[PDB]
Design a protein around this ligand. Structure first.
Ligand code: K
Ligand code: K
Ligand code: K
Ligand code: K
Ligand code: K
Ligand code: K
Ligand code: K
Ligand code: K
Ligand code: MG
Ligand code: MG
Ligand code: MG
Ligand code: MG
Ligand code: MG
Ligand code: MG
Ligand code: MG
Ligand code: MG
Ligand code: MG
Ligand code: MG
Ligand code: MG
Ligand code: MG
Ligand code: MG
Ligand code: MG
Ligand code: MG
Ligand code: MG
Ligand code: MG
Ligand code: MG
Ligand code: MG
Ligand code: MG
Ligand code: MG
Ligand code: MG
Ligand code: MG
Ligand code: MG
Ligand code: MG
Ligand code: MG
Ligand code: MG
Ligand code: MG
Ligand code: MG
Ligand code: MG
Ligand code: MG
Ligand code: MG
Ligand code: MG
Ligand code: MG
Ligand code: MG
Ligand code: MG
Ligand code: MG
Ligand code: MG
Ligand code: MG
Ligand code: MG
Ligand code: ZN
Lengths: 110, 150, 305, 59, 99, 43, 154
RNA sequence: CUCGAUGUUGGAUCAGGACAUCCCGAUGGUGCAGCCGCUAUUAAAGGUUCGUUUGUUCAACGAUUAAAGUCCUACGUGAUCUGAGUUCAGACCGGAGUAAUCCAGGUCGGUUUCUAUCUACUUUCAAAUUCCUCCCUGUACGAAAGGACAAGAGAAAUAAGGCCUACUUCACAAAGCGCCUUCCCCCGUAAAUGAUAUCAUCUCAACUUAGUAUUAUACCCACACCCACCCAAGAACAGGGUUUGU
RNA sequence: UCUUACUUUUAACCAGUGAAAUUGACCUGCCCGUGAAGAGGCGGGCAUAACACAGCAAGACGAGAAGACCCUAUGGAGCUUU
RNA sequence: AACUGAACUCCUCACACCCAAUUGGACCAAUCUAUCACCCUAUAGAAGAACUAAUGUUAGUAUAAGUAACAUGAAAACAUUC
RNA sequence: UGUAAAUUUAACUGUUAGUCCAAAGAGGAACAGCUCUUUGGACACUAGGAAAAAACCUUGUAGAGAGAGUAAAAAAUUUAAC
């Protein structure tokens, strides 16, 4: 089946500009209180999530160097320690991963 | 078109002719070439016709300007501010006389469709018709099927 | 201009407190209506021929077999009355129809999810909001005061009822499932044509008649099952055992009414009128009412002697 | 649009608002003929008796 | 082409309008359109339909007089037709002769 | 329903045309003129 | 019609679905936090919770060991399950994982989620926090609560 | 009209319509005792089978049925299907022809495209038809043989609308081979009273009865919490729930 | 008979990329009638706020190929021949 | 007993100003040339001298259509592993 | 008689595939919107009318008018006593 007649621009504008075709305004955008960048209410802040991932990647690279090969997952818990810190009483018997930087303020030692 | 063009109602300029008639043509500006063939008829109109036409119309200031031009033109200006330009290219002397006389007699209003061939500010002397014009009145202005003094 | 919901701004401490608070108010409001006859009831008129009483709203619990004393097996559907109350009365004059109407509601729902206009309606009534509201055509002598609770014992074994509910929704369906068309053969050369409508009209009219059966949305519409016999009533749990199956999925809400079939006209002479008032009832009803022909669970095994 | 200006009522009752805006009643197009029981004795007496029935006819 | 041919319809529709308007004005006085137009001619009143329509709208007292005149001439016609020639011509039925 | 076979005003089966009162009067009016023509052509 | 169909149709069929979910779960056990398309994480989350329950049965339960052998494609993770992850949740009856939606993926705009085993050593996710109890609304409700408690004791 | 193409048989699928009715309803006549028939008036809501051979439409035959209706719709319907036949290119037989080749003949084989722009349409929501069994009854009827109707009861089939307790395919569910529900009227005539026409006469006389439904009632009906999550709701959208938002 | 369930593909929605035949103009309804003889466009009626998305294939004598059947042309060509 | 009703006829003014093929006639766009003209013209002589249609030719851009259709196994430290 | 054409001379082209209506006939079936001749009309040119409408009726010579008189022009019918 083929078109019997060319569709006019008048007809086409009605189809293309029908409210159903238009982009809807989003009402769920808000400011992230921690960083001030924008976020959606139900979604994690992109700026804060990236910050966490970047530190997570650095720690994982350190874990790699300590393991030094595939199939070397430890059978004990792990703790991340930053410059100027020492193992606590509850950190004894745990693999220590040492980061050459100051503990981020948002990374509370537990 | 009528639909594809503007229109207006029949009218006059300052109620012309009511108290006195005032010729609306106010100025005529001719542009004739000394040597152009297309101005031959315009040159003959300036030699024998324009002077006698000016005597008859002392309220119209005529400006004849001889200068090089390929298309001689007459520009008519009216009291209401309308400006009309009419080419006299290759026109005969009699043709130009006819055109100039027509310009003298026109009011200067736009030559467009006139909705009505008449105009009046007092269309009614006895009272314009309304739905009660020919209706009788009833005692106490009672409406149809209206109980009085209930 | 951004939308909000009830607990959006509530703190960790206030969310449990608010839930408990509104829950307790809901329960208290339902308990305050348990004595309709001590709270200025409307006149209780006697049943007369031609009288139409109110129906109920119930939830469809499921299905169950029962056996009759003649040995025959009848499957039945359990319908539980869950927080059924009269909501509004509209007089015959203002109804726009031939009869008066009485609005009934069923099943308590969260107030945090209802429109403001509905909430203020229920606030004046003093009841928690209901999921479904239905309109029952009644005669003037059967009017009941808004806020009166309705119970399963409104119906009695041996009665016949009509049950209306939304059918199960099957979405967009082809002609074979929707209309029972035969389709076309599976082999002998059929080309990409097995479940299709075929011809939809004649060539002459050069159009398709209104009402022509075609693929489209199936189910999810109101249907009514007529002439269902009430086999049993459990007064403790407020469950009505109706013969056969009723439209809708399990846990849907159904509209239960006295059967309008001509054979069952004027059989309400012995039925509660305008309704059953358990508080008014002099002698408490047994936990189960049975139709005379039903084999009760504790009855001796059938013997054909 | 014209049909919106037409107000049909099956009986003599007309809503009060409609009654208050009425201006003129139009004459009925058909003259309603009088039933025989509606004629006054003057009218009946004015119409002549056209024939003399036999005195011995049972009728 | 439409603009050219419309000049015929304009004249036709204008006269239809005048007849409709004259008919309405005549009915307000209990006269049908043919009775007014016909009897006005018999009074040697040559007012055309355009003017008659204008008079109905803007000079209703003159129009009622014209309706009365037509009605009077119409009644004189009936009286003459019913007569056997004994009666003299009606006062408004007399025709002014020209030569 | 009520179709006329083929074209309306030709052929074997046609749409019937009836004579109105004014069609009759129109014809008689011209018959009177011709009758008078006969007379004035007789002398 | 798909009434009551609780499982998604992903991958190349039923087997591929399990393999797809297994590879995700293996990644989660090793790294303890992974990001993947939202639908796939939601599907896998149930298995990740149940895996811990099998880990709690102990490494001497042969059925648990067979389950772990199938679901963990890297065998060094099986000791971690029985000796690290399961002991960490000894005092919980469930809720071992947390799943949060993250911004759409850049390339294909896929809806994305991050999932992690609670109690890991990684930097904490920027979790959503409810409004402070000191806000205007929460203080007005605290007053209402205080008032209701005082009237009940009386 | 159409050859700068209106696709050609039968079948499948879905059927719209006419009534000159095959079955079911209501009536008049009968060489109508009854049971069966024949004929005519009225009735188009509903229904109108499965098979063997044949490409068949038909036809014959087997077994049923209350009945297996007649027609129109581009001999309805191929942008839905089919390709057995028919009607290209191969081939054989009989016949014609000097041969090429040919025949209303027969015979085997032989590619059925299209992503839908427009019109139209995509729940006319919800009153049901029919057969059989029992009974009436071995009654009415009749010499006998034979043998009803009305009322009443029961049990089925089909159709329409739903459903999952069990069975079955199956297994958080969808299904049938399973289960549940299904309700009004039909106008042809047959009779009184009684004029024109002082009997009579059912009346395009005034009128009375069989004899009629405003088709009944039923269903539907309150709505900016709504970012988000769940769903028996769903293509998207919409809809229900969240007092089930760690 | 007589269909049903599930998986994959396709599908629909989001994101990227982005063809083709087709197209006089279109402000592109239904019925009956009419007519170059089968009407969305004419006559008489009826219907009728506006605009998407998904399906359908009854019509647009739908698209595609200047009908291959048929006839015609003092148009061709292959083949046979007394 | 009348009225309505044409491009018929009258009325005011004007008048060459409503048939295919075909035929006669009056004008004329732009271009070049001769001589004029000199904000775009005149008299003549010339000619590749005028395009709403050839399934026309070339180029541009629409319509169908943001439609048909097309593509990257998974996680991760990008090492690696599955 | 009322009229203004006519023949001749010179020079050419196009038309030579025809439709309905009335009338006289032929063929066919006293069928065809059928076929074939004859006389005339209309159409293939205008406008009005017969519902829409080439072929029936009215009417033709060309413009403007917001005058006027007309032409053709609408379908009638209702029934069985003795
Ligand atoms: K005909
Ligand atoms: K053809
Ligand atoms: K066969
Ligand atoms: K269309
Ligand atoms: K199945
Ligand atoms: K009689
Ligand atoms: K189609
Ligand atoms: K006519
Ligand atoms: Mg559903
Ligand atoms: Mg099948
Ligand atoms: Mg194929
Ligand atoms: Mg197939
Ligand atoms: Mg006129
Ligand atoms: Mg015809
Ligand atoms: Mg997939
Ligand atoms: Mg074509
Ligand atoms: Mg049918
Ligand atoms: Mg019949
Ligand atoms: Mg066919
Ligand atoms: Mg087709
Ligand atoms: Mg074949
Ligand atoms: Mg041979
Ligand atoms: Mg083969
Ligand atoms: Mg064959
Ligand atoms: Mg096909
Ligand atoms: Mg398709
Ligand atoms: Mg019986
Ligand atoms: Mg009698
Ligand atoms: Mg008598
Ligand atoms: Mg698609
Ligand atoms: Mg896309
Ligand atoms: Mg084309
Ligand atoms: Mg037609
Ligand atoms: Mg569409
Ligand atoms: Mg067309
Ligand atoms: Mg085609
Ligand atoms: Mg051809
Ligand atoms: Mg040659
Ligand atoms: Mg003239
Ligand atoms: Mg003239
Ligand atoms: Mg020039
Ligand atoms: Mg050229
Ligand atoms: Mg061009
Ligand atoms: Mg072209
Ligand atoms: Mg499309
Ligand atoms: Mg696609
Ligand atoms: Mg000749
Ligand atoms: Mg002919
Ligand atoms: Zn942030």
């Amino acid at each position: 089946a083929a078109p019997k007649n060319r569709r006019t621009i008048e007809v086409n504008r009605c189809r293309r500009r029908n409210p159903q075709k238009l982009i809807k305004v989003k009402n769920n955008i808000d400011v992230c209180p921690e960083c001030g960048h924008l976020k959606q209410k139900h979604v994690l802040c992109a700026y804060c999530y990236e910050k966490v991932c970047k530190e997570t990647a650095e720690i994982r690279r350190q874990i790699g160097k300590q393991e030094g090969g595939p199939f070397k997952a430890p059978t004990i818990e792990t703790v991340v320690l930053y410059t100027g810190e020492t193992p606590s009483e509850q950190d004894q018997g745990k693999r220590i991963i040492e980061r050459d930087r100051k503990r981020p303020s948002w990374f509370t030692q537990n | 078109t009528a639909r594809g063009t503007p229109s207006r109602f029949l009218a006059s300029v300052l109620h012309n002719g009511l108290g006195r008639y005032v010729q609306q043509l106010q100025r005529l500006s001719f542009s004739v070439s000394r040597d152009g063939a297309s101005s031959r008829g315009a040159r003959e109109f300036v030699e024998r016709e324009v002077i006698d036409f000016a005597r008859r119309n002392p309220g119209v200031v005529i400006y004849v300007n001889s200068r090089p031009c390929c298309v001689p033109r007459v520009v008519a200006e009216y009291l209401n501010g309308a400006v009309r330009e009419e080419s006299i290219h290759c026109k005969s002397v009699e043709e130009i006389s006819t055109l100039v006389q027509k310009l003298a007699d026109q009011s200067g209003l736009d030559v467009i469709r006139i909705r009505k061939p008449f105009h009046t500010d007092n269309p009614s002397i006895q009272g314009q018709w309304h739905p009660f014009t020919n209706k009788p009145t009833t005692f106490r202005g009672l409406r149809p099927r209206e109980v009085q003094d209930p | 201009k951004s939308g909000t919901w009830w607990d959006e701004h509530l703190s960790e401490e206030n969310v449990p407190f608010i839930k408990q608070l509104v829950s307790d108010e809901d329960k208290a409001q339902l308990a305050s209506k348990l004595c309709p006859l001590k709270d200025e009831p409307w006149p209780i008129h006697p049943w007369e021929p031609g009288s139409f009483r109110v129906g109920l709203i119930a939830l469809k619990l499921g299905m169950m077999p029962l056996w009759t004393k003649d040995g025959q097996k009848h499957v039945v559907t359990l319908l539980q009355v869950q927080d059924c109350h009269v909501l509004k009365y509209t007089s015959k004059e203002n109804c726009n129809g031939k009869m008066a109407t009485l609005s009934v509601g069923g099943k308590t729902v969260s107030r945090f999810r209802k429109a403001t206009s509905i909430l203020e309606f229920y606030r004046e009534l003093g009841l928690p909001p209901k999921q479904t509201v239905k309109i029952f055509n009644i005669t003037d002598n059967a009017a009941i005061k808004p806020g009166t609770p309705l119970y399963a014992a409104h119906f009695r074994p041996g009665q016949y009822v009509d049950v209306t509910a939304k059918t199960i929704g099957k979405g967009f369906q082809g002609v074979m499932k929707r209309w029972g068309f035969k389709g076309q053969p599976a082999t002998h050369g059929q080309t990409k044509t097995h479940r299709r409508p075929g011809a939809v009209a004649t060539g002459d009219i050069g159009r398709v008649w209104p009402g022509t059966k075609m693929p489209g949305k199936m189910g999810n519409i109101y249907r009514t099952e007529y002439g269902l016999k009430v086999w049993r009533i459990n007064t403790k749990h407020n469950i009505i055992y109706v013969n056969g199956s009723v439209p809708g999925h399990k846990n849907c809400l159904v509209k239960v009414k006295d059967s309008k079939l001509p054979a069952y006209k004027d059989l309400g002479k012995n039925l509660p009128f305008p309704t059953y008032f358990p508080d008014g009832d002099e002698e408490e009803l047994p936990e189960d009412l049975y139709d005379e022909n039903v084999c009760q669970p504790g009855a001796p095994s059938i013997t054909f002697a | 649009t014209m049909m919106e200006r037409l107000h049909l009522f099956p009986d003599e009752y007309i809503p009060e608002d409609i009654l208050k805006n009425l201006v003129e009643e139009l004459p009925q197009p058909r003259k309603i003929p009088k039933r025989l029981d509606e004629y006054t004795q003057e009218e009946i007496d004015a119409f002549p008796r056209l024939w003399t029935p036999p005195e011995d006819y049972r009728l | 082409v439409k603009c050219t041919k419309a000049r015929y319809l304009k004249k036709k529709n204008m006269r239809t309008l005048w007849i409709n308007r004259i008919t309405a004005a005549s009915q307000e006085h209990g006269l049908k359109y043919p009775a007014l137009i016909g009897n006005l001619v018999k009074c040697q009143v040559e007012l055309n339909r355009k003017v008659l329509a204008d008079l109905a709208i803007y000079e209703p007292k003159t129009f009622k007089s014209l309706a009365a005149l037509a009605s009077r001439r119409r009644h004189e016609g009936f009286a003459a037709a019913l007569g056997d020639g004994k009666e003299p011509e009606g006062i408004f039925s007399r025709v002014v002769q020209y030569h | 329903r009520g179709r006329i076979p083929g074209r309306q005003w030709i052929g074997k089966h046609r749409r019937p045309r009836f004579v109105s009162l004014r069609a009759k009067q129109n014809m008689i009016r011209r018959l009177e003129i011709e009758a008078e023509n006969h007379y004035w052509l007789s002398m | 019609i798909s009434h009551g169909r609780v499982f998604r149709r992903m991958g190349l069929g039923p087997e591929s679905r399990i393999h797809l979910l297994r590879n995700l779960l293996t990644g989660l056990v090793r790294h303890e936090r992974i990001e993947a398309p939202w639908a796939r994480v939601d599907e896998m989350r149930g298995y990740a919770e149940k895996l811990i329950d099998y880990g709690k049965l102990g490494d001497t339960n042969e059925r648990a060991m067979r389950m772990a052998d199938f679901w963990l494609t890297e065998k060094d993770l099986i000791p971690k399950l029985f000796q690290v992850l399961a002991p960490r949740y000894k005092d919980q009856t469930g809720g071992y994982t947390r799943m949060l939606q993250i911004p759409n993926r850049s390339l294909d705009r896929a809806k994305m989620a991050v999932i992690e085993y609670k109690g890991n050593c990684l930097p904490p996710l920027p979790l959503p926090r409810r409004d402070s109890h000191l806000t205007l609304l929460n203080q007005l409700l605290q007053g209402l609560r205080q008032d209701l408690r005082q009237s009940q004791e009386a």
